[PDB]
């Protein structure tokens, strides 16, 4: 249940936002503000359910949409080689 980045992934906070770099492939990705917030809270050890609760309490988003959006982001992070399965 623990969200983990792949070992070769580095993170930077920049003026464009949060960036993830794959040190093997050289691919690097920009996360928008919501994606960065989700990833940061998952890396803190919070569950996706925790993060959904946070998003609904802080943003104009329904709980159902928050859960789907978190799940889609995590799936995309795994798809694109940033997060471990």
């Amino acid at each position: 249940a623990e969200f983990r980045l792949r070992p070769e992934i580095s993170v930077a906070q920049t003026d464009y936002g949060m960036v993830l770099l794959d040190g093997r492939s050289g691919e690097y990705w920009q996360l928008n503000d919501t994606a960065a917030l989700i990833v940061q809270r998952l890396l803190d050890g919070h569950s996706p359910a925790d993060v959904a609760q946070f998003l609904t309490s802080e943003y104009e988003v329904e709980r159902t949409d928050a859960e789907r959006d978190i799940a889609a982001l995590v799936t995309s992070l795994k798809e694109n080689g940033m997060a471990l399965p």
Partner: peptide
């Protein structure tokens, strides 16, 4: 509450040898 923008991930580029 804050305006919600759905999470987005964008590939910026690929670092290679020069």
């Amino acid at each position: 509450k804050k305006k919600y923008t759905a999470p987005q991930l964008a590939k910026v580029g690929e670092f290679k040898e020069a």
